[PDB]
Amino acid sequence: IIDGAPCARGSHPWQVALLSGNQLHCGGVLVNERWVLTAAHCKMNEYTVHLGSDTLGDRRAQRIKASKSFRHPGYSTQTHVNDLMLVKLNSQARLSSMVKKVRLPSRCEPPGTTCTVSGWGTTTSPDVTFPSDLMCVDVKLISPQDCTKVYKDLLENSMLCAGIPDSKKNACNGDSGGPLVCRGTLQGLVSWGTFPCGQPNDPGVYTQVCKFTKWINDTMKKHR
């Protein structure tokens, strides 16, 4: 997360981290006791899922293995369209004040809405600085029309753009798959942006969760 600050402790109980070799690989969100929602870009054969702590490396956190994942079939590595994946936990997440399900959206939030993106990704770019504590930043939803001026026809209607005018405030490598929350609901998953990160007036691009409700629910049902 670029130009943010540590999240208030206990305010992101639905946030998870996907680890590989005890290093941060991606962010993600807890959907229910069995399922993590993240970016299809985060695909691995095995995951170690961190839950229940704002601190990576915290002994108090749950560490659950996951051997099954399902990327949305429309996912493209060329264009990052349909950048979403469900990760099936090997054992159920044990819920508490530090481990809760995210509220999935019914509606899409309009452009101009204030949102919060969170993650353990680098706070500097190109030089890397991975924090221990979960970082937060407030961004605003940007219209597809304004976002098209920067990314042209690489943008699809399933993607959501967010940022602040003339600001470095954004998500970066490590935050991928993480949550963008607007008005109590999950509206996006960190997908892509420019590199180096935190370039002013280059919006962060997210998978627009409200367009993928049916697939999310059907997939969890199918692979229960």
From Swiss-Prot:
Set out the biological process GO terms recorded for this chain's protein.
epidermis development; extracellular matrix disassembly; positive regulation of antibacterial peptide production; protein maturation; proteolysis
Q: Which InterPro entries match?
A: Peptidase_S1_PA, Peptidase_S1_PA_chymotrypsin, Peptidase_S1A, Trypsin_dom, TRYPSIN_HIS, TRYPSIN_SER
Class of enzymatic activity (EC top level): hydrolase
Cellular component GO terms, alphabetically? cornified envelope; epidermal lamellar body; extracellular region; extracellular space; secretory granule
In this UniProt entry, which residues are annotated as the site Major binding site for inhibitory zinc or copper? 80
Q: Which CDD domains match?
A: Tryp_SPc
Main location (coarse class): secreted
Q: Where is it located?
A: Secreted
| Sorted UniProt keywords | Disulfide bond, Glycoprotein, Hydrolase, Protease, Secreted, Serine protease, Signal, Zymogen
**What up-regulates or down-regulates this gene?**
By estrogens and glucocorticoids in a breast carcinoma cell line.
Write down the EC number: 3.4.21.117
Q: Which reaction does it catalyse?
A: Cleavage of proteins with aromatic side chains in the P1 position
Q: Which cysteines are joined by disulfide bonds?
A: 7-136, 26-42, 108-210, 115-182, 147-161, 172-197
Start and end residues of each Peptidase S1 domain: 1-221
Q: Which family does it belong to?
A: Belongs to the peptidase S1 family. Kallikrein subfamily.
Q: Which PANTHER family match?
A: KALLIKREIN-7, KALLIKREIN-RELATED
Q: What does this protein do?
A: May catalyze the degradation of intercellular cohesive structures in the cornified layer of the skin in the continuous shedding of cells from the skin surface. Specific for amino acid residues with aromatic side chains in the P1 position. Cleaves insulin A chain at '14-Tyr-|-Gln-15' and insulin B chain at '6-Leu-|-Cys-7', '16-Tyr-|-Leu-17', '25-Phe-|-Tyr-26' and '26-Tyr-|-Thr-27'. Could play a role in the activation of precursors to inflammatory cytokines.
Q: Could you identify this protein by its name? A: Kallikrein-7
Q: Which organism is it from?
A: Homo sapiens
